[PDB]
Write an enzyme that holds these catalytic residues in place. Structure first.
Site: not given
Ligand SMILES: O=C([O-])CC(=O)C(=O)O
Length: 181
Positions: A75, A131, A154
């Protein structure tokens, strides 16, 4: 293998990488060459995390004697990694980069080759159509090996066996960088 520096995202911590570490150890990495940072600023601001990552990499190189590190980033860790390469002193210290659901396009949508003329930085960007946090247009990098998977959320990027296989491929030199130097 190079030492591996693992870079967490917003609200994350080094223990986010516990399952990836366990996988890599069973695939031939030494546990003593796997390093996961803990950022102080859990909101991911580059002005904090860029310099912290720089010093962490410097420390890893200093205690291992390696020429370069490899990076696995999740991320916002992807954005922090690209900022380190683009604006700070990371251009000649990194060999292989793997991002997982990376928020890369907040910094660059290009796979930045770095500044070692003998060796472009190689990238694997893994992202999932399921995601719900990071839209895939932020993760895809022009010039990288871009890998779209399905059905994995995610957070499960950090556990999924399918994702781990691509991490292994990237750390073994299977990424790409088809941009010009
Ligand atoms: O760019 C360099 O090699 C110098 C550097 O990493 C630092 O100031 O720690």
């Amino acid at each position: 293998h190079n030492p591996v520096v693992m870079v967490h995202g917003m609200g994350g911590a080094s223990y986010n990488f516990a399952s990836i570490k366990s996988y890599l150890v069973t695939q031939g990495w030494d546990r003593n060459q796997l390093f996961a940072i803990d950022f102080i600023d859990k909101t991911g601001n580059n002005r904090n995390n860029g310099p912290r990552l720089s010093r962490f990499v410097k420390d890893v190189l200093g205690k291992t004697g390696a020429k370069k590190v490899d990076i696995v980033a999740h991320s916002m860790g992807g954005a922090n990694t690209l900022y380190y390469i683009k604006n700070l002193d990371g251009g000649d210290k990194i060999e292989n980069v793997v991002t997982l659901g990376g928020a890369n396009g907040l910094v660059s949508l290009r796979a930045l080759p770095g500044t070692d003329p003998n060796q472009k930085i190689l990238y694997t960007s893994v992202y999932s159509s399921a995601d719900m946090i990071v839209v895939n247009s932020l993760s895809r990098l022009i010039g990288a090996r871009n890998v779209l998977i399905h059905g994995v959320g995610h957070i499960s990027l950090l556990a999924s066996s399918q994702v781990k296989g691509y991490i292994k491929e990237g750390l073994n030199g299977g990424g790409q960088n088809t941009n010009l130097e």
